[PDB]
Design a protein around this ligand. Structure first.
Ligand code: D5M
Ligand code: D5M
Ligand code: CL
Ligand code: CL
Ligand code: NA
Ligand code: NA
Lengths: 520, 520
């Protein structure tokens, strides 16, 4: 038969294939969908009143719908695969994908007298649809939990969909928009029924898997001397102290002086903090210290900020308070976890072209030099883009994000997601799922009221995401061995990126993308 | 319909057909699959610490998967069939096979208040796949229990899959590899869904079902005398005792002296032990006595060793402590069972070309003979292969193993499984099965955690293995009746290879392969 209950409505594909440039990832996981909001759209707001501050106010709605998110690299990549990709390519980018939902099973749970039994409702349905026109608030790219699990074996719960609208305090404005998912043409399923579609990534720039092997400043030959001169002295050396103009040709020895065609990238000052406890000043400056941007009278934290080097050499302990991504160690607590639990990423690789996060961009003269007045200079903590700058985008990690929807705005600049990734105008459409409400027996005499009693049930099934990535091979003529991600030989009680003695896959550290080195 | 619940998704084939050389075996058994490891991959290690010795240390993983093993002769052969094959062929070998899984039924068991009920989950699925590329640690050929039952009627449990990786003590090394079965493209089934495939055995040498009827030493005509001489005496006979060189032509009477073109096979000394209790020395030399090979600082027992004759004639009671296969009598206990329970196989058939297990290979001179110094000789307990050797491989039994995967190594010698069988580089692929986890109702509010609650269920179904064997008929011109496996006429209370009064099929003794005799 075509579609029956005693028939697999799809298969399990979890494979990675490398041919030439194209690497194909395929993942399958087993999901479970709870009933959300008792089949109800609820208005949710957080007020100014009460303990909560004004910066955490919001207005929105929580829907009875769940959504499928695969926006995390680890979903499509095995740790071993991530290794192959990082260690041999100068870049890569998504090309197309394929989604599938199958072997859907709906169960109805009954409880009597502390006795609980779960069996099948076959006639029951499950609704699915894609926001192919992008008419629904984009949830994804907010780094929200609920993406497919990293380990294929694990079975996961489907995230609940909800959105935010313009708000003043705990109130909404005239502008704020209320969306109803049901007002969307969605496809329905019964077990033996399957859903699926395909999408093709708009053209996007290859991510850089290469870390520079020349600093922006050191772009010139040591042996030669520039044909240009610079002002070397305003005053005669020694006792005389009489103003004079002396000019010198910037040479190899005087490298700093010599003129350059390109200058470092932009910077927003980030407060510095040291892993060692003692060094830090004894105040709770987590918030007061941190850089932030104020929008509509509300100050939001600048996380994770513009792309900047985490630390200057040998300052490894240092990190921006808010200027890097942080990943919890497995089993880590959501609130107030200790330092040991967290994995603080490090973006030092990009130090060569990008400004250090914790230091000034540089200095600019504050006044005209005078016969009486002395020259002055001021520091640059906040530096915007100017002609001649070059820079590197923030890195993605095996457990990082992949893409993000570029806001539909009149304009924007270098729209590469600040958390790292590919910026798409038309990203993979949001996939929405929901269990169709099955009413409990209605009262015998007609009632104008809307039914408030339903059979309790949840659904389960497999999901498949297959993505085709385009690689960009290395062309380096570097004579010496390059740096590469490896797993240390030395013995240990547990294996890296494996299950422990209890059956708990764990990702020991974040894994960057740039190991291979390319010239500037 | 094509695939429905009320439809047999396969039939029962249990037949043997003989045409010409080709004998075709077909078996079908009914299996049951329990849930394994609560749907969890678990890290398993045995430590140096505690009672366990260092030689029993290991590191590995236990998977939620089960595997189908047919690697035992009795599965495909009826005892009567084994008889026909052994009693009329000089050899045979596997040619191709066909596997099938069908009539899959998944049951979900419920327990309330000490009340247990088992019914059907139809929408539930079962995953299956073959390691057609050999990317998974090879379990088979380790003589592990869990192969299809010998008796067709019996219903069996499916073995759990698990593997081992490089370990130091209870720790893993950097090299050690962790495999995830789910990362394998596997096919899913619902009842009315069936799986199946075919494989063809790489070319392999016919097993020898023939026992030699000439000793390697006695390969020459009695009547004739060799045209070659040997050194018969170093000293004059009688009183004189003065050195002289005397040479004689090796004749029929002096058979031992005469030169030969071929010499016996290799040997590793095996400690001798007698079935009679009194003869044996009163010490627990089971381990201390036994020969062993030390790998990576760990001593493993040499079981079952190289192929060697169990005993010289009339030494029938004797056997190598570790140098023969042992099969438990039906109902025999796993640990510390008495001698009566066990069936100790006997490889005396091969004594003619192979060295006796318990005796030295022979002797070699230890020094140069001297006018003053006397000649000396030393025994050879360990003897490696040298030009001119010929030997017989170890026999397979009706309840023995069939093939084994030749380790993917740079080199090897005469790669015939030491436990007996056919050595294949690409053996029948491991067949992996697993019940797909069906989650218990999830909590209403999204949780980042991985689901830990599942409906309890197991599966059942029929399995079919069909193998085509190629025979090699006897060509003997032997005038007298040959020895053959028979069942003794004399009355008994139970029939050989039948069920007893309780319904317990039992294999009374091991059944060899070599009865027919061929010349050397
Ligand atoms: N990841 C990503 N997504 C979307 N747009 C991006 C991305 N990275 C850079 N850009 C911007 C930068 C330029 O404005 C343009 C490509 O020009 P070019 O001269 O090639 O830099 O796209
Ligand atoms: N059972 C089995 N499996 C695999 N390889 C085997 C087996 N028996 C012997 N051999 C080896 C011995 C030789 O190296 C080769 C066949 O050569 P020949 O001159 O025919 O002995 O194969
Ligand atoms: Cl976490
Ligand atoms: Cl047994
Ligand atoms: Na709510
Ligand atoms: Na276990």
């Amino acid at each position: 038969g075509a579609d029956g209950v005693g028939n697999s409505s799809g298969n399990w594909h979890c494979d990675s294939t490398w041919l030439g440039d194209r690497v194909i990832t395929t993942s399958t996981r087993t999901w479970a969908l709870p009933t959300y909001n008792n089949h109800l759209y609820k208005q949710i707001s957080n007020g100014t009143s009460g303990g909560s501050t004004n910066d955490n106010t919001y207005f929105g709605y929580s829907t009875p719908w769940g959504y499928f998110d695969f926006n995390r690299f680890h979903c499509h990549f095995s740790p071993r695969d991530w290794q192959r990709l990082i260690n041999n390519n100068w870049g890569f980018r998504p090309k197309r994908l394929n989604f599938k939902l199958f072997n859907i099973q709906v169960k109805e749970v009954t409880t009597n007298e502390g006795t609980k039994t779960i069996a099948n409702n076959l006639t029951s349905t499950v609704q699915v649809f894609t926001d192919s026109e992008y008419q629904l608030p984009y949830v994804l790219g907010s780094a929200h939990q609920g993406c497919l699990p990293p380990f294929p074996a694990d079975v996961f719960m489907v995230p609940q969909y909800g959105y935010l609208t313009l708000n003043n305090g705990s109130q909404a404005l005239g502008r704020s928009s209320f969306y109803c998912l049901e007002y969307f043409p969605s496809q329905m399923l019964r077990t033996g029924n399957n859903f699926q579609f395909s999408y093709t990534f708009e053209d996007v720039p290859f991510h850089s898997s290469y870390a520079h092997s020349q600093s922006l400043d050191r772009l010139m030959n040591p042996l030669i001397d520039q044909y240009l001169y610079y002002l070397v002295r305003t005053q005669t050396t020694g006792t005389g102290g009489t103003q004079t103009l002396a000019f010198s040709q910037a040479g190899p020895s005087s490298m700093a002086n010599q003129a350059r065609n390109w200058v470092p990238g932009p910077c927003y000052r980030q407060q510095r903090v040291s892993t060692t406890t003692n060094q830090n000043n004894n105040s709770n400056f987590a918030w007061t210290g941190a850089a932030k941007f104020k929008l509509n009278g509300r100050d939001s934290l600048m996380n994770p900020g513009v792309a900047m080097a985490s630390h200057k050499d040998d300052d490894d302990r240092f990190f921006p308070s808010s200027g890097v991504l942080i990943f919890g160690k497995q089993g880590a607590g959501n609130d107030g976890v200790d330092y040991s639990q967290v994995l603080i990423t490090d973006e030092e690789e990009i130090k060569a072209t990008n400004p250090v996060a914790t230091e000034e961009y540089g200095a600019v003269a504050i006044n005209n030099q005078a016969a009486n007045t002395q020259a002055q200079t001021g520091l640059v903590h906040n530096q915007g883009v100017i002609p001649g700058m070059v820079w590197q985008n923030r890195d993605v990690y095996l457990q990082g994000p992949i893409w993000a929807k570029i806001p539909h705005t009149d304009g924007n600049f270098h729209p590469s997601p600040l958390m790292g990734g590919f910026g798409l105008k038309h990203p993979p459409p949001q996939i929405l799922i929901k269990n169709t409400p099955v009413p409990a027996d209605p009262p015998l005499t007609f009632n104008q009221a809307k039914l408030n009693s339903f059979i309790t049930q949840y659904s389960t099934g497999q999901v498949s995401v297959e993505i085709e990535w385009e690689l960009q091979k290395e062309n380096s003529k570097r004579w010496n061995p390059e740096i590469q991600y490896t797993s240390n030989y030395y013995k240990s009680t547990n294996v890296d990126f494996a299950v422990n003695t209890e059956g708990v896959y764990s990702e020991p550290r974040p894994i960057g993308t740039r190991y291979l080195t390319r010239n500037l």
